[PDB]
Write a protein that binds this ligand. Structure first.
Ligand SMILES: C[S@@+](CC[C@H](N)C(=O)[O-])C[C@H]1O[C@@H](n2cnc3c(N)ncnc32)[C@H](O)[C@@H]1O
Length: 218
């Protein structure tokens, strides 16, 4: 099938992997920039903020990792973003995330201000701010789990293979530098670890994609 239909929140049925990048650090400031600890340390200090929390680069790298993956190219992946200010974003699987941080910031600034980004020539949304909670958008049958260092370690393939034939898997991954992995406790009934080492979010995203790709023969 050279053309798998693009997965969106409107399909409640198709079995897929969903990744939610939670506590994402995406905040605009008119100086419009995305605030970040590399460029805006003095400012963040003056705002009384923990400098280390301003990490939009984490969300940027997780997006590049997830959207480049074989599972995305196979049409079996969705990504949502929950920012630390409570904004929910649905990412269209076909969207092109710029490699440079500068252009990613420009894109996110437009998204946060206009509330969507339309498809260039064709005219449907490539990124859209949507109403909370995430659970109004996920497939009807969908296992929900948080990835955490503090949790028992699983092999992704084992985990994925034990899903029912119609059951999606939604994984919540912290898009932050630090903090408790409690960001999705309202949504999940299970937490799993993927390694005996603390990982970056991009690595944890990558491990989970690889195990799904393997299990699903992608
Ligand atoms: C760099 S960690 C930051 C937050 C983490 N609680 C901490 O304090 O170090 C970013 C995210 O990657 C995931 N992660 C990090 N290590 C992991 C591991 N060993 N197994 C599963 N997920 C992990 C978690 O979802 C985590 O929130």
């Amino acid at each position: 099938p050279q053309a798998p239909p693009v997965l969106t929140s409107k399909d409640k049925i198709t079995k897929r992997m969903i990744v939610v990048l939670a506590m994402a650090s995406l905040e605009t400031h008119k100086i419009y920039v995305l605030l970040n600890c590399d460029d805006h340390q003095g400012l963040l200090k003056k705002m009384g903020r923990d400098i280390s929390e301003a990490r939009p680069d984490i969300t940027h790298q997780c997006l590049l990792t997830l959207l480049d993956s074989p599972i995305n190219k196979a049409g079996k992946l969705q990504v949502y973003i929950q920012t630390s200010r409570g904004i929910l974003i649905e990412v269209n699987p076909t969207v092109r995330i710029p490699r440079t941080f500068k252009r990613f910031s420009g894109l996110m600034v437009q998204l946060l201000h206009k509330l969507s980004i339309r498809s260039v020539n064709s005219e449907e949304k490539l990124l859209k701010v949507i109403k909370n909670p995430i659970t109004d958008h996920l497939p009807t049958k969908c296992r929900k789990v948080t990835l955490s260092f503090d949790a028992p370690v699983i092999r992704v393939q084992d985990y994925i293979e034990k899903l029912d034939d119609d059951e999606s898997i939604c994984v919540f991954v912290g898009a932050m530098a630090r903090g408790k992995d409690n960001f999705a406790d309202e949504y999940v009934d299970e937490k799993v670890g993927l390694s005996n080492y603390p990982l970056s979010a991009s690595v944890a995203c990558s491990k989970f994609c690889h195990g799904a790709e393997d299990a699903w023969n992608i």
